[PDB]
Symmetry: D2
């Protein structure tokens, strides 16, 4: 098209007078995403089933991300959903960026072929001391870039930076992401709510009340439709493009929520705020949480500002 | 691999002593599904965005299916979700099969990139008179073959015939569907329920009671998880592979349900029963309904037999 | 398109009242050619160079062909350029066909990326005794089908059978070979000659005289252009589509020529004669040679009939 | 792999302290090459043959190159084999580079599917006046970068810059060119000669003598093999990787040779000299010719230094 992601990032880098390190990191991430997307779509699966006479997909996707990021020479600390500790990049390959990611979000949808994706959040190292896990413990408000690749009906890379959110469709015939939605903004009010209602017995009173309103509107408006793919990248992408609200609040399993702060909640909250939406725990903005553990969890409610504000008012009412 | 769908259908045709007409119909459908899959995944999208200086996807998918089926020389009547009247195949291209299909199920999810699919049902012409719409008005029990292609994280073709259900993964590197799950059988009891709960105000008492039991099990077992992608092919495929129950019952917009009998409900009911599951409207088996309109709708409840039976027992209790 | 190779072979099998065994053999060969093509074009090469942290191409191609042919259940004896002995198919996988092939012709051009291909010849088993090498020792005149797949700028499968030659272009986006040139016939006279002139010191007097006439036409016409890719499949395909003559005559390293009779010369001679061309050793028709060794060589001159006849007349003049 | 072309060029740009303009130009060219390669391999050809119910390849390839180069914002003048005049880029899209290219070299091999390719040469604008055709008239010695993409058995991008030549294989599964041959150097002496011998009656005495030596070596060494694909990119690539010599000297058609100086001869001479080889007209170095017309032709002899020197000595002998 007129605009490839490669051209977009290179132009954004030149406008920012970057040294080329962040541009290289973003180019490396795009490469990883294409390698993951091809594996996810099962190109070459015949070679595993004996056509000429292994690693799980999530593990392979982690290896792709890690390898491609270390070889960018732009990173110093990596936090992955798959690794118990932060990965400290070798001194020879060290750059200034800290990346938190989930290489293959929705991995429990993997076997039923439901949409899955990769989520990432990028920070600039904060201190001058040896890179360590604490470099990945900055609040989401410090993000320099975040987004996700969705391996859905087609593969799309959504990238959010200071000035906004842009969506790029992967054209797998030529391995280019094409800019198709510019400076995306979410609708102020949607008509879809997204939550796993199987935890109904464990929900707090405010979530319980809010769902009841979506089904039985007190002003007699049309009830909201319900959608829950069960893969955060897919439900979040729908929320972004169509509007509405996505909820993964606390319950019994965890009064801290299920989703991970560093590489699930923070990245999606950043994309949402850059698109004009909101992302809250129900009590505080996700992006201002000060993380204390790289695998910390957090409740998250995100989406159209009027819908998220309505839920916030209910929590306030109950407080 | 060892088994391509081309080899599988050819061997099944030889074992049945077919003349080759149904084999050719099935080979043509496979070809159409690969062309659809490539368009769905947006291979070549850069050519629509000016890389070198239109039809919607559902329309394109329909043209692919119709053209490829007509050119098989195996059909006489086609019913498509997209066309108001049954298509009567020209005399020169006429064979004995009647095909009912939705070329791109889940079209409302197209723009948010969630999984979408193609659903098909194949019948043998019943009468000796000129082919007409009435040849597509057979109960699903008369199906000779049905299934779907899901364009999800990967593309899979699920084919059900008299002796059972088989799953073939499309390897897009060579354009072959590889047999990956043989003689599939659904779990007797699942732990996921799938329904759009935004219609809660319009549900009948039996659905209402059932959903409440999934959330607050009277036996104190763990509540079922909820999933609702909102694309029938995706929810039904997850139901088949992981077990559980999928529901699209009657509501206010339709006391006859929303999903179409000939090319949504019948094909999915046939796959389910061949896999050892159940498919009911809540009062009668979907496959035994004798349709009177090619675009008739029907309520549908399908999935693991213990789950569907529990819901049928509630209906019976209320009656 | 209107005609896929899958549809073409299935229709040809139905018209011949075949049992489906040769149709299945041809479908399996198509599958093998797509797997080879994808490997030749290096799809997935990044996985050999550490993107996420072996067999030569000719060997891989051979394994693909052998595995796919054995699993067709249509063959009993395979002769490959790569194996010293004929392969005798296990009794359980045995059918009636004998296949001679070069899985990756032009292997010397592999490293410089010039066009390479797969050549095949198919015979019906002749006798009632245990299949053995002798079943592959039939003159090319007994071929039931032959052709090649060229991995050139695009991949094309050329198939010759009793009634003629057809060309099918592989569309790698959907893995279908599309009929693009029907009932192909070679030009009666070309204007290109193809031979390795580095053996000029070893050529017989008739080849020497002929080449001199192409360069200095005694009738003062324009000299023929010269082309010699050095991969038989590529030179022969150009000969078929544009006309002219291809020569690999006897030399010093071999007074019997270099090219192999069973899986290079016979298949190409059969395609040529079905397209209205000629294929001679300079003294007798290639197709009428009764081989005595599966790896026997033969001199070969093939192409437009007026050109080949002019060269045969020189041989006769000298005799 | 470890090294993609995108990473390679970005690192080379940062080492050179470029502003990012040349990096962007090279990234744009890679994008064009992938779009051309997919069209050349005929992905999507089924859509031209009626699968769901035009521009020639050379024209399409020209449109891709021009469009992608103008949108790089890095060029001011473009010279293409397909356009009679130089293209002056619009002031808004103007950068400092001058690009000469043949978008699809070997287009007479197109219909027989022989290897074809794209050749390019990049110059930095020389003067401060309005960009015009004269900006493309610098001797090849001023090139900042040159190379070619070969659409052969696999697609390879060969890029030559001040410090040497590197070869990158296109992995079409992910649209990345992977570095596979680093700092390539041609053999000092080869054993292959490449020339169209159909012009034997029109060759000068030195070429005539040289060919006779390759066939009948006066010191009784083994004669050289002969190869002539008839596509300059293919014959040149073979010469680079295997060694030997490639000749397209003057004759009757033109005592100035056939190949074009600006976008055939200069680029290939630059690649050859950067790889340790030679490229001469027989009388002067190609790279030092001062061009007087954008479509000027020039004789060219190129390849292994010992072989090219031997031919130069023969020309000198004859002078
Ligand atoms: C989830 C992990 O997925 C894979 C792991 C593999 N590990 C190891 N090897 C793999 N592939 C493989 C194995 C043997 C040969 C080839 C092969 C040979 S030629 C060729 C053409 O690209 N591919 C590929 C894998 C493929 C995977 O996914 C296919 C969709
Ligand atoms: C939703 C319908 O989608 C398409 C419709 C098209 N109609 C018309 N033309 C299309 N593509 C197009 C247009 C111009 C040139 C080419 C082209 C030239 S060379 C090439 C290589 O495959 N493709 C393709 C379409 C592509 C579509 O989807 C691509 C992802
Ligand atoms: C010349 C033989 O070529 C190959 C041999 C291979 N053997 C073994 N493995 C191969 N590939 C490979 C290895 C590890 C992982 C994967 C892989 C993982 S996910 C994926 C997606 O297709 N591919 C593939 C091979 C690839 C070849 O060619 C690729 C162009
Ligand atoms: C040599 C020119 O090549 C092409 C020109 C085209 N011009 C115009 N349109 C083209 N393609 C086309 C036309 C209609 C529909 C589509 C299409 C619809 S959906 C889809 C999936 O990518 N592609 C593509 C062309 C394709 C070409 O090459 C195919 C290998
Ligand atoms: N490609 C890019 N896109 C957006 N911002 C960038 C880019 N490159 C650099 N920047 C900005 O400039 C900073 C420093 O760049 P760098 O010198 O490459 O680390 C970044 O951390 C961003 O704030
Ligand atoms: N490929 C096939 N797979 C399964 N059943 C087949 C196949 N081909 C034919 N049959 C059975 O044989 C009947 C008639 O085949 P046909 O002569 O092709 O119409 C079918 O309608 C099926 O009952
Ligand atoms: N697909 C086909 N195309 C052309 N001829 C065929 C085909 N199938 C069968 N035949 C002819 O029928 C004979 C026997 O077929 P079969 O019973 O499959 O072995 C062949 O050996 C050919 O002569
Ligand atoms: N990617 C690159 N690779 C090699 N050299 C480069 C690159 N970018 C810039 N240069 C060198 O630096 C010069 C100026 O770059 P630029 O400012 O982008 O025009 C070039 O003309 C080359 O000499
Ligand atoms: O099954 P549950 O509890 O609804 O959890 C689903 C969530 O878990 C995850 O799979 C974990 O990341 C998310 O993608 C998704 O939103
Ligand atoms: O939006 P609703 O009413 O839940 O309907 C969704 C259903 O409609 C369809 O999109 C139309 O067939 C189905 O794929 C899906 O099951
Ligand atoms: O190098 P030579 O002797 O010209 O032989 C080339 C021939 O050898 C082969 O590579 C081997 O079969 C053929 O494809 C080709 O025609
Ligand atoms: O047919 P001839 O005169 O040998 O010309 C072939 C040459 O012409 C071209 O096709 C023109 O670029 C070159 O690729 C090739 O080297
Ligand atoms: Mn995960
Ligand atoms: Mn549908
Ligand atoms: Mn061969
Ligand atoms: Mn040209």
């Amino acid at each position: 098209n007129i605009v490839t992601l490669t051209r977009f990032v290179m132009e954004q880098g030149r406008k920012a007078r970057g040294t080329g390190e962040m541009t290289q990191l973003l180019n490396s991430l795009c490469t990883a995403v294409k390698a993951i997307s091809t594996a996810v779509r099962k190109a070459g699966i015949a070679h595993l089933y004996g056509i000429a006479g292994v690693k799980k997909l999530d593990v392979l996707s982690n290896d792709l991300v890690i390898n491609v990021l270390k070889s960018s020479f732009a990173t110093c600390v990596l936090v992955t959903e798959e690794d118990k500790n932060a990965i400290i990049v070798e001194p020879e390959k060290r750059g200034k960026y800290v990346v938190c990611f989930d290489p293959l979000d929705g991995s429990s949808n993997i076997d039923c072929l439901v949409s899955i994706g990769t989520i990432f959040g990028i920070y600039r190292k904060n201190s001058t001391d040896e890179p360590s896990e604490k470099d990945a413990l900055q609040p989401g408000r410090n993000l320099v870039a975040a987004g996700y690749a969705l391996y859905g009906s087609a593969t799309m890379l959504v990238l959010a930076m200071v000035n906004g959110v842009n969506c790029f469709m992967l054209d797998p015939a030529i391995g280019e992401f094409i800019l198709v939605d510019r400076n995306v903004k979410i609708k102020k009010k949607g008509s879809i709510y997204s939550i796993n209602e199987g935890y109904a017995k464990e929900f707090d009173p405010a979530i319980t009340e809010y769902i009841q309103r979506k089904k039985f509107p007190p002003d007699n408006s049309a009830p909201y439709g319900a959608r829950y793919v069960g893969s955060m990248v897919a439900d979040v992408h729908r929320t972004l493009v169509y509007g509405g609200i996505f909820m993964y609040p606390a319950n019994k399993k965890s009064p801290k929520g299920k989703l991970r702060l560093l590489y699930e909640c923070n990245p999606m909250a950043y994309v949402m705020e850059k698109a004009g939406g909101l992302a809250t725990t129900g009590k505080e903005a996700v992006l201002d949480i000060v993380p204390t553990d790289i695998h910390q969890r957090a409740p998250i409610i995100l989406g159209s500002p009027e819908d998220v504000t309505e839920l916030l008012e209910i929590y306030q009412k109950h407080a």
